[PDB]
């Protein structure tokens, strides 16, 4: 649909003996493209998805060089953020980064985000106009204000709006086929005795792109809401998606019973039933 | 591509 | 990629106005300019970074420089000149990161006689 | 801001000679230039990072060395008359208000 490229950024420091350990992953949309480990004997960039491997030595050169230096600054960040809250060497630590871009449909930046978090919770975040900050605490603004006196905003505005775009518009250019495809869930309906008068409905949509879809029970045209047992969507490990949602019935009165699907392969409503 | 690095130092936080 | 200042020598005598013209060719959406002095004493000197996504007019006193994306332009204007401002000055430009190249015009030397 | 050596220097064709930039402000990106009358600042070589190096406008008869962060170093290794100019070592950053991004330059003579 609208299509969006977003790096994720994770700097841990250990109280044992290590330096700070720094990971980033690449994402278009739903689909991983990029790792990087600091861990690795020699860390280098390596491509997790089949039309980045086009790309020539150059490319992952820059990209290595790129997530080597921002891996020795994490490890100063990760120091003087310890400084900021007043903790001592003995805890683990945690920096997070999330930024990128969503594509607009002029084929320009629509928004940019730029937020990190310290120990699992918001800490600096850019602005919807990418040229001021929004600090969670006073820890942070300590951040704001270095970053203000960098002019870091102009930096970042500068790829989210520029590089982050175009490099978007070619990674959508060169996957078309799989990036800009939705894959429709195959769904089926399962049912399984869980008692003598009752059975289980499980209502299964598998193998689907993106992970968004929405799986609904009814009864006579009723939100069985309340009633249904609805796991978190999973990944296939193929790239592809899972989820299943089910309702316990009394056994007899399975045709009252109705699945509804919503997914953006799907470009018409979806109604199942069990079927024997 | 992720954010690419500056001319001029890399700011930490 | 150019930085072409098409002024070679440019006579003024004091309180007259001036504007140094410089026109430039980008690649890139994304990109930032300079203007540097260089006072007979040989040194580079800053005087302002524009970026590309900035705004058209800034005033540092008698410095003001009007930024043109349109005309791809970065007009730099001394007002009320002095015989302190003869020097040569250079426009430059360069992508915003460590891999481009900051790329200089060819200076426009600028002589304030009393 | 940025260091430079020497600030002048007389050689004779065919000599050897490197010149020195040094920065503290711990930029990743550095630059030589050289200066000739009318011609303005022409890139001879930068460096993006430690161990990178890469050619500009006018690399031709010159070598560069980026040993750390810190240094970037310009050896001319057979000198020639058209080699005299004025070096200028370079590194942008974001705070030009406040920091030097210029060295002072050498003046360099290359006499036969």
């Known amino acids: 649909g609208s299509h969006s490229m977003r790096y994720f950024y994770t700097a841990m420091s250990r109280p044992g003996r290590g330096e700070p350990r720094f990971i980033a992953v690449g994402y278009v949309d739903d689909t991983q493209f990029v790792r990087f480990d600091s861990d690795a004997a020699s860390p280098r960039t390596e491509p997790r998805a089949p039309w980045i491997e086009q790309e020539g030595p150059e490319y992952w050169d820059r990209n290595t060089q790129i997530f080597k230096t921002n891996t020795q600054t994490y490890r100063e960040s990760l120091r003087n953020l310890r400084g900021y809250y007043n903790q001592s060497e003995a805890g683990s630590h945690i920096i997070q980064r999330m930024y990128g871009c969503d594509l607009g449909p002029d084929g320009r930046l629509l928004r940019g985000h730029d937020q990190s978090a310290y120990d699992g919770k918001d800490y600096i975040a850019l602005n919807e106009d990418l040229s001021s900050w929004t600090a969670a605490d006073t820890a942070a603004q300590i951040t704001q204000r270095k970053w203000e006196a960098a002019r870091v905003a102009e930096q970042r505005r500068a790829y989210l709006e520029g590089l982050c775009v175009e490099w978007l518009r070619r990674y959508l250019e060169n996957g078309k086929e799989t990036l800009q495809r939705a894959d429709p869930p195959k769904t089926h309906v399962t049912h399984h005795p869980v008692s003598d008068h009752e059975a289980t409905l499980r209502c299964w949509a598998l193998g689907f792109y993106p992970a968004e879809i929405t799986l609904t029970w009814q009864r006579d045209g009723e939100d069985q809401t309340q009633d249904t047992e609805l796991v978190e969507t999973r990944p296939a490990g193929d790239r592809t998606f899972q989820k299943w949602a089910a309702v316990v019935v009394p056994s007899g009165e399975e045709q009252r019973y109705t699945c509804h699907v919503q997914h953006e392969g799907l470009p018409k409503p979806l109604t199942l039933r069990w079927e024997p | 591509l992720p954010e690419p690095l500056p001319q001029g130092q890399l700011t930490a936080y | 990629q150019k930085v072409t200042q098409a002024q070679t020598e440019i006579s003024v005598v004091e309180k007259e106005d001036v504007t140094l013209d410089c026109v430039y060719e980008?690649?890139?959406?994304?990109?930032?300019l300079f203007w540097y002095k260089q006072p007979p004493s040989g040194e580079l000197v800053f005087l302002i970074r524009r970026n590309s996504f900035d705004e058209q007019n800034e005033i540092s006193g008698r410095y003001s420089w009007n930024f043109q994306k349109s005309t791809s332009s970065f007009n730099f204007t001394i007002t009320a000149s002095q015989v302190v401002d003869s020097a040569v000055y250079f426009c430059a430009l360069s992508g915003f990161y460590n891999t481009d190249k900051l790329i200089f015009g060819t200076g426009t030397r600028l002589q304030v006689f009393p | 801001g940025v260091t430079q050596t020497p600030k002048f220097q007389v050689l004779k064709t065919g000599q050897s000679m490197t010149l020195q930039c040094a920065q503290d402000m711990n930029h990743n990106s550095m630059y030589w230039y050289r200066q000739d009358p009318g011609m303005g600042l022409r890139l001879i070589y930068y460096?993006?990072?430690?161990?990178?190096?890469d050619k500009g406008e006018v690399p031709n008869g010159y070598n560069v060395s980026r040993l750390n962060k810190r240094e970037f170093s310009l050896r001319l290794e057979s000198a020639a008359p058209s080699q005299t100019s004025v070096y200028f070592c370079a590194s942008p950053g974001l705070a030009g208000e406040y920091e030097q991004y210029f060295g002072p330059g050498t003046r360099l003579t290359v006499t036969e």
């Open positions: 460096s993006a990072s430690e161990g990178t190096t």
């Open positions: 980008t690649r890139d959406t994304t990109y930032y």
